[PDB]
Design a protein around this ligand. Structure first.
Ligand code: HEM
Ligand SMILES: Oc1nc(-c2cc(-c3ccon3)n(Cc3ccccc3F)n2)ncc1F
Length: 190
């Protein structure tokens, strides 16, 4: 995921502010080749970061506020990119129990330039679910951008939380997904 992440980013700055602004972004990153390929490569992580820090100084958009909105655009692009991937899904909850089984397994088999960490899923009940992610590069803001984007297309109301034990720790993060009434809050505390 790097060639199509560039596609979403180019389309976002061109429509939101202009092509002149997109021109400045291009100037910051010198391009040896054409500069716009297709999804099939695999650049560095700093490459994406360089275009992110320029987007944080050119539009004055924070790296966290931009990571949220960016998550929404690219995720719905995949929905309109794989029509039968949407048909096979039944709900966002089922989506959580399908992410590790076939979604990232089918891609891994048909795309060897990607690598994934460990994923486990415990079930506490109906209104509580737990997702454990073991990775050395855990960005909570990025994860919320993709999970909430999915709940954006469906228009549901799920809330992704986190625990304080690994709240400020890396390598392992404990997430808590809770199904709220969808129209109630401040029922208990915290
Ligand atoms: C909400 C749905 C999904 C979740 C939560 C999810 C989550 C992830 C995570 C956590 C990463 C790596 C991010 C990181 O560790 O920093 C990732 C990467 C990737 N995802 Fe997804 N993904 C989802 C759906 C998709 C979809 C729709 C596609 C396409 C079929 C897809 C293709 C990939 C590929 C190939 C990677 C490899 C790792 C990378 O992005 O660098 N993902 N996904
Ligand atoms: O004219 C167009 N406008 C938009 C658009 C639509 C929304 C929106 C409206 C309701 O919720 N989000 N935004 C807000 C926004 C989103 C992300 C970044 C900056 C932003 F300002 N931008 N997208 C395509 C167009 F062709």
């Amino acid at each position: 995921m790097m060639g199509m992440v560039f596609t979403g980013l180019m389309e976002l700055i061109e429509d939101e502010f202009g092509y002149e602004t997109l021109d400045t972004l291009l100037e910051s990153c010198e391009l040896q080749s054409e500069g716009i390929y297709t999804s099939v490569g695999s650049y560095d992580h700093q490459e994406l970061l360089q275009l992110v820090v320029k987007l944080s100084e050119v539009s004055s958009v924070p790296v966290t506020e931009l990571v949220r909105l960016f998550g929404k655009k690219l995720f719905v692009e995949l929905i309109e990119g794989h029509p039968e991937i949407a048909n096979e899904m039944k709900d966002s909850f089922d989506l959580l129990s399908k992410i590790d089984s076939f979604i990232h397994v089918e891609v891994y088999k048909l795309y060897p330039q990607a690598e994934l960490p460990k994923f486990t899923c415990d079930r506490l009940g109906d209104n509580d679910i737990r997702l454990h992610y073991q990775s050395k590069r855990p960005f909570a803001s990025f994860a919320e951008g993709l999970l909430d984007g999915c709940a954006e297309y469906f228009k549901e109301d799920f809330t992704i939380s986190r625990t304080p034990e690994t709240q400020d720790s890396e390598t392992d993060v404990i997430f808590n997904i809770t199904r709220a009434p969808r129209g109630a809050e401040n029922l208990y505390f915290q």
